[PDB]
Symmetry: D2
Subunit: 331 residues, 4 copies
Amino acid sequence: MVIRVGINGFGRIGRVVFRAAQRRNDIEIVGINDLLDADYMAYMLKYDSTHGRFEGAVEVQGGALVVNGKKIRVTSERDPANLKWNEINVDVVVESTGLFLSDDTARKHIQAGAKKVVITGPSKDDTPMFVMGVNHTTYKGEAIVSNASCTTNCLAPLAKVLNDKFGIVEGLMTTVHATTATQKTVDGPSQKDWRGGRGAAQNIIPSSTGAAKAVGKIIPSLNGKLTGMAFRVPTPNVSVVDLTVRLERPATYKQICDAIKAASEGELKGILGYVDEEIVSSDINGIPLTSVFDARAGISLNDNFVKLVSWYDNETGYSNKVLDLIAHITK
Amino acid sequence: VIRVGINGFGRIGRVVFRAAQRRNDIEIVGINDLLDADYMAYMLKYDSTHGRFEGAVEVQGGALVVNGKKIRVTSERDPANLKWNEINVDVVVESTGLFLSDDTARKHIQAGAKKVVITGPSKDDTPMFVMGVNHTTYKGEAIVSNASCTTNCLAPLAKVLNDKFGIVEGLMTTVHATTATQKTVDGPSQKDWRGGRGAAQNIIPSSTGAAKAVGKIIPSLNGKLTGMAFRVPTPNVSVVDLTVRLERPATYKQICDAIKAASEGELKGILGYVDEEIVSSDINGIPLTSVFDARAGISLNDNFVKLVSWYDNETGYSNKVLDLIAHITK
Amino acid sequence: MVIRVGINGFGRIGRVVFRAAQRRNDIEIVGINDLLDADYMAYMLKYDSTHGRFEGAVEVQGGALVVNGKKIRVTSERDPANLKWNEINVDVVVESTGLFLSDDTARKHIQAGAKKVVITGPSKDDTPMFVMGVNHTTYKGEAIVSNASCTTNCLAPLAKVLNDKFGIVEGLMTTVHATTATQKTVDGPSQKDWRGGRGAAQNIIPSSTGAAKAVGKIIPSLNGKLTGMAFRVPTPNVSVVDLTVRLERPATYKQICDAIKAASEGELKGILGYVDEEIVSSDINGIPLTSVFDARAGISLNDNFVKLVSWYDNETGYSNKVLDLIAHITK
Amino acid sequence: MVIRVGINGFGRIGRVVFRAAQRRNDIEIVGINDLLDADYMAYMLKYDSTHGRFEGAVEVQGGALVVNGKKIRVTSERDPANLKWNEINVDVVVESTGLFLSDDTARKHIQAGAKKVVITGPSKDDTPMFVMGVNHTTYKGEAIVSNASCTTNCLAPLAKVLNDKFGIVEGLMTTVHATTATQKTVDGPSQKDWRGGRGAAQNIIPSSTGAAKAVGKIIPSLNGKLTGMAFRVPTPNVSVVDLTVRLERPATYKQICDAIKAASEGELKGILGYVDEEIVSSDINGIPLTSVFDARAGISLNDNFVKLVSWYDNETGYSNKVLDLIAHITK
Ligand SMILES: NC(=O)c1ccc[n+]([C@@H]2O[C@H](COP(=O)([O-])OP(=O)(O)OC[C@H]3O[C@@H](n4cnc5c(N)ncnc54)[C@H](O)[C@@H]3O)[C@@H](O)[C@H]2O)c1
Ligand SMILES: NC(=O)c1ccc[n+]([C@@H]2O[C@H](COP(=O)([O-])OP(=O)(O)OC[C@H]3O[C@@H](n4cnc5c(N)ncnc54)[C@H](O)[C@@H]3O)[C@@H](O)[C@H]2O)c1
Ligand SMILES: NC(=O)c1ccc[n+]([C@@H]2O[C@H](COP(=O)([O-])OP(=O)(O)OC[C@H]3O[C@@H](n4cnc5c(N)ncnc54)[C@H](O)[C@@H]3O)[C@@H](O)[C@H]2O)c1
Ligand SMILES: NC(=O)c1ccc[n+]([C@@H]2O[C@H](COP(=O)([O-])OP(=O)(O)OC[C@H]3O[C@@H](n4cnc5c(N)ncnc54)[C@H](O)[C@@H]3O)[C@@H](O)[C@H]2O)c1
Ligand SMILES: [Mg+2]
Ligand SMILES: [Mg+2]
Ligand SMILES: [Mg+2]
């Protein structure tokens, strides 16, 4: 059974989701909505500064996008209620504009004829959030879900392994994060995030994030036990989680590594990765894992206090798991 | 003292504001953007490119207080509603990047201002000026343009060469710093596809009418110059790369001597002359609009030469905007 | 019939040459020399910030490099004379240290048992230089050759088309060039190139280059008709030639484009490329062409005075042509 | 009363120490040693990508540097033993080559006629290290001292306030650090630090650092209670400490801020600073403080577990405190 999917917001996540969908037989992107002509949309798909040339055929024929022989409806509707998803029989919508992160806005896709919606960001409201490999089995057939944030998808699988094996008393996270689309090339206006308005190439830019706290929803036993912040730094992609955590039961650094390696080859296979090499961020570019543990980078103070490092391609990992979630909620 | 309002407190708007603090003939009395006063104070106080504001800044009752002087802060999206007359504004610096024509910029005059300086090249037949090159052609027009940063770098250089040796024809490249219109990662730029690609990752080609506009600034060079741009990942300071054919032969030393002479005479404070192993950040903060790099350029022969001139695209332009304000009110 | 190659200098060119050689049947790398342990060389091959992970297996067995199961001798000899190339029966050495750009230094590989040497930079002496597609047929069986510079391999094919079709009166070139290994992260010492010592990430940095003048040697009819300079800018790879040229016979921009396009499909196929799209530098990353003409980027003042833009991956294009030159000089 | 100082190693620290010395009456730089001609040294002093044009007058007269009316001897001795510091009556040598971080090597300055030496890095041996404002009063008249690291100088004043007021149970530190001269523009050789060889502009690059552990020597009561690591990111200057710490006595975030503010106005005035604004890294560029507490950036999980953020200009702050140490050890 092939799932028919529409994308709203053909941005970094929308376009990276699109490419990943191409390598799957169970998902077909049959419609795309943004504020772009079909020919510009084709160009943005074909050429990518971060992930290179698109491996496939793209043509524009009569205002529709034709990719690898398939016609894809292209629209320019600012209001999702007008998207008429039913006319192309769309099952699930990828909501990746970054503008519609609540039930009252995202449900407009269902009003427009879609059956289900995956929001590609943290919920503004009580829309349930999921992290593949951590709490996806708690899905109950809801029509609208959230795939949480890229950072939460990095921290939660790491947090799960530790909490399961040793238990987490409490933790503080820093994510050192690549530049994103919300940032500015030179000091410019960001009325709700003053620091985020400062030139991205020139600065280390601190930021607030609810991603560590959000892990409390993904892993309920950790509710109120984790929080943190971020530094935005001048790279185009790939980010890293820096988790300082207190453990319930003692664990040597080797034992933590053995536990992470085991989960990476067992239950968290294809989600959590294990690396024991001298890597740097660009070595992670293109990796579809959502959490890549860096064994050599981290350090133990003692058997109950440890700093752990995990990489994530914030575009690619998240995007592949958006597709995993689509397959899961439709199974 | 000329009372000035700024529309668009962006890179140019704010660098103009700082430069004005160091002028005795100009006072900024109103600023319009889409910002609260406290955010506006913050953007002024801290600058990634030019450092901490060299003055006192505070907010008192929804007004900006800078060096003890009160400045009206508004958030009118439509310039027609700016009520410049209520703070007795003479001239408006139009630096939003949105109003580059007579019909749009004239809304400031509808709103009570007397004159308007547009801080970009005109979209229509609004006259453009480059200080030191054609500013004496100003005829009392109420609305003028200060052209572009690139034109302000190229025109003084072209003038010196054209006056002394004459220019047959020339092609220009500007290697340009990143600007606010660009994107941090590949994003939407429907009218400029290349410019939408991530700025930090790329050398990004661009069209520019900046060399061709020198034809309007120096009429004898009409149809004799054109060029393009490469946008590269630096935050500020740009450089002009002019390949030019000369009418009368000149050695490289002779070209340099003419430029040096002009920089000490008629073009003092506009065109500069440097004879050192400099790089772009050495030009950051320089108020000149054209800084000739003697050592960087090269002659093929006595009639064919490549000349290099730096410009702080924020600071030089911004200072000459203020020079143009003083000139058109003189 | 397969040419056995040794690499001296496993730097950017050595390693990109190595990767290009993996996809060729007529050339195999059997030895590498640098100042590195075998396991560090393996790491440098495996992970590449610019060109991503090595597409294959890399391992160390007994002080040797094992790539896709094939053993490669690893040595650490500072003096090329001690390399014992005869012991692994190397035919041709890729001299890519950047230190040995003369007959006197490079011939030490021949003393050490190699038959021929390709120097991967411009000659300091009268060692003959070549650009594939332009003057490679002038090769006369010399034991030591140079593949000229990356910039010269971009300019010469473009200059050749213009010169052949319309004739070049005079020309001035600018290359806007990516950062390279000789540059500095922050202002540091560069006694023979002061500008080049200034922080690379912070600056546009003017530079001298003999690349346009050297095209006068590659294309003798253009001797004394070309020169230029460079600006080094903060990108990691891919550079662009900016050629301002006066033509003998009149040509419209379309006629110039048609000529370049025809050559790219004919005589200069696989050397000179033709692009008619809104590309930026990163789109050229990984392209094995030595010159990629950007039709939309350039501009004519008139039918005899024109500015032409041509891209080049300064690592990949040059490296592939080093291998093309090796194949040619042994044929 | 005026201390006569020679600088060995006119690099980033040497040149920034030099400028800071111009604005002090109690310190005179009377000699500089590097591997540079006098005119190149003049140029390196005059133009600085990070801190702008030098404000004073600089000239070369007969192989000597003349700055603001004072003559400065320029030498090119690779071996410090030959520096003849006595011929220009040098009291203290600033040892900032980065090569001589032990008693055996730094003592060559004393052989060469100097009375005392300040090493501008952490000691490799048992050479005593100091952080101004924290343990400088433990100085006992030693001829050779170390000013520790830039990172230690940021952490120790912050850790001192917390330990004094609330007590530190344990802590783990991350420093997000600007690029330095030891790094590479593109993937290059770094045999003793593989990650550090990777292209700095392209990467977030993890690194080990003993700076947190070293605070155990600066503050003995904290021995074994702190350690940490680093991420090197592509900015030219200014770094930030990210300290996750468990407190003995409970404290609100407000209480932590008030305690740090009080110290910044009292005992640690001019050493530790307090900022309550939406700043980013470039706002700290040029600040001579060694630790600038960012009240708004940090976050508490609870009253005993907190993450604290403190900035530092790694060139300027450290360089100023080098001079403060010179003033102190000669009083
Ligand atoms: N980039 C990451 O690493 C990352 C990771 C995880 C989650 N996210 C989240 O995904 C969402 C999008 O992120 P992004 O990086 O792709 O941003 P983006 O700016 O690159 O993409 C947003 C796209 O939506 C388009 N758009 C804007 N308004 C629209 C409208 N009314 N209707 C239809 N399309 C519209 C825009 O043209 C743009 O192309 C955000 O919520 C983000 O927080 C991003
Ligand atoms: N940055 C340069 O180097 C440079 C040099 C010369 C000329 N210019 C030109 O100056 C103009 C502004 O350029 P910039 O770099 O300062 O861009 P910018 O984006 O930094 O500044 C634009 C400012 O205008 C504000 N604004 C947007 N809409 C507004 C509205 N309706 N009303 C009032 N304010 C509004 C924006 O919030 C922003 O602060 C452009 O036309 C530009 O081409 C720029
Ligand atoms: N990078 C480019 O874009 C490019 C293009 C064309 C030509 N070239 C030229 O090729 C040559 C190499 O350039 P690069 O960018 O690869 O520099 P690089 O620094 O990246 O590589 C040089 C390598 O040689 C090693 N080496 C140094 N001394 C050695 C010795 N005595 N014996 C053996 N190995 C030694 C070094 O450890 C290093 O790994 C230069 O001449 C360069 O100008 C470079
Ligand atoms: N840069 C920082 O942020 C920082 C902060 C604190 C401490 N430090 C430390 O200070 C020391 C220098 O740091 P840096 O950033 O200034 O490095 P740097 O590379 O900028 O300076 C080193 C200087 O020493 C010169 N030199 C090399 N060998 C020499 C020799 N035999 N004799 C005389 N001079 C020689 C070099 O030419 C160079 O100019 C290092 O130990 C560093 O860890 C650096
Ligand atoms: Mg599919
Ligand atoms: Mg092969
Ligand atoms: Mg002094």
